[PDB]
Amino acid sequence: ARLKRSLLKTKENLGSGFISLFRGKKIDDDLFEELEEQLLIADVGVETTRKIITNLTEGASRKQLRDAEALYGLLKEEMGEILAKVDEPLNVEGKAPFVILMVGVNGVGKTTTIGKLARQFEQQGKSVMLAAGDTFRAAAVEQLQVWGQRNNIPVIAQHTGADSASVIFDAIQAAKARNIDVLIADTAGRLQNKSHLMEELKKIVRVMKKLDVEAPHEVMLTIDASTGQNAVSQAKLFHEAVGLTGITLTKLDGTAKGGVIFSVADQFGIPIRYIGVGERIEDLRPFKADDFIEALFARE
Ligand SMILES: Nc1nc2c(ncn2[C@@H]2O[C@H](COP(=O)(O)OP(=O)(O)NP(=O)(O)O)[C@@H](O)[C@H]2O)c(=O)[nH]1
């Protein structure tokens, strides 16, 4: 029930938060407007809120419901369906190496997610290597090097400002030579220039093909739930630039903006591989839609 308390701030307005809104009320246009306002304040987003209201209105009409309290169950089903469409756990087994290209802006949890994932894979018996492909941020590169040395995890890094694609190429070659199961590659996160960063990512992906026609095996976006709609605009920008195959959504604990997960799910349809629900390694949890919905909707 750790997930339940990590969602405590989001549950004021969503899930169990619906109970106080519906109590004793009739289903009418006023109620659907109050619900729409609550969804929007919770960062569910305009398009996804409209879809939820439309589907809920139709679902209640088909059953000729009049008691607003029963909208709780319909919302649980319908918001559950939104998340079920992006429930698909990441499987990194069986490659040599499985290459995860980590993309996203700076400051939203990318290097922390790299460390937690690396520790989780090693805890499962997989060997891990890191590639310090954010080559102009010497602090980020030093962070991976020092942390990897402490953890007996090899880190491939080159001089400040080295070509990111070449660093990652060299890391894949090294991983293949050293029986590495998983290679996790960091990338630059300065999206102030759309064209440049997005051209760098395309170059990285093309260069990988010299060594493995299947690499990268996962392109993972990291976004921060506490940034609300910025998480959605970041996903949209990276989705148009590169072939995203997974999303990690960090910092759900302690934000009232957790509703953004429904917007990310609905707008892009990309699997949410992990959600960050605390500061421990194990608090980067593989995303399971039914578990999340149960925690969000359970009262108390
Ligand atoms: N509570 C919480 N904090 C998280 C989570 N994921 C990352 N963080 C925190 O947010 C920060 C991580 O951001 P970070 O990975 O440093 O982003 P970055 O771009 O790699 N680094 P920088 O901050 O130098 O730009 C740290 O405070 C880290 O502990 C999460 O799921 N929950």
Tell me the C-alpha to C-alpha distance, in Å, between residue 86 and each of 81, 119, 286, 298. Answer: 9, 24, 12, 21
Q: Residue type for 194, please?
A: K
Size (the chain), residues: 300
Phi (first) and psi of residue 43, to 5 degrees:
70, 25
DSSP secondary structure letter of residue 278: S
DSSP 173: H
CB 165 within 8 A of CB 203: yes
**What is the distance of C-alpha 104 from the center of its chain?**
10
Q: State how far the Cα of 173 lies from the Cα of 153, in Å rounded to an integer.
A: 16
Given the DSSP bridges, would you call strands 272-276 and 246-250 parallel, antiparallel or unpaired?
A: parallel
> From atom 22 of ligand 1, which residue's Cα is the shortest distance away?
107
Q: Whose CA is nearest to atom 31 of ligand 1?
A: 276
Structure method: X-ray
In angstroms, how far is the first alpha carbon of the chain from the final one?
11
Taking a C-beta distance cutoff of 8 angstroms, is the pair 184, 128 a contact? yes
Resolution in A: 1.7
Whether the CB of 109 sits within 6 Å of ligand 1 = yes
Q: Does the beta carbon of 104 lie inside 6 Å of ligand 1? A: no
Query: 207-221: string of b/e by CB count within 10 Å (b at 16+)?
Result: bbeeebeebbbbbbb
Domains of the chain: residue spans and CATH: 1-85 (1.20.120.140), 98-297 (3.40.50.300)
Residue 290 is which amino acid?
A: D
Is residue 186 classed as helix, strand or coil in its secondary structure? Answer: coil
Q: How much distance in Å is there from the Cα of 72 to the middle of ligand 1? A: 34
8 Å CB contact between 251 and 224: yes
Helices (H), the chain: 2-6, 18-22, 29-41, 46-62, 71-84, 110-123, 138-150, 164-177, 194-208, 229-241, 260-268, 289-297
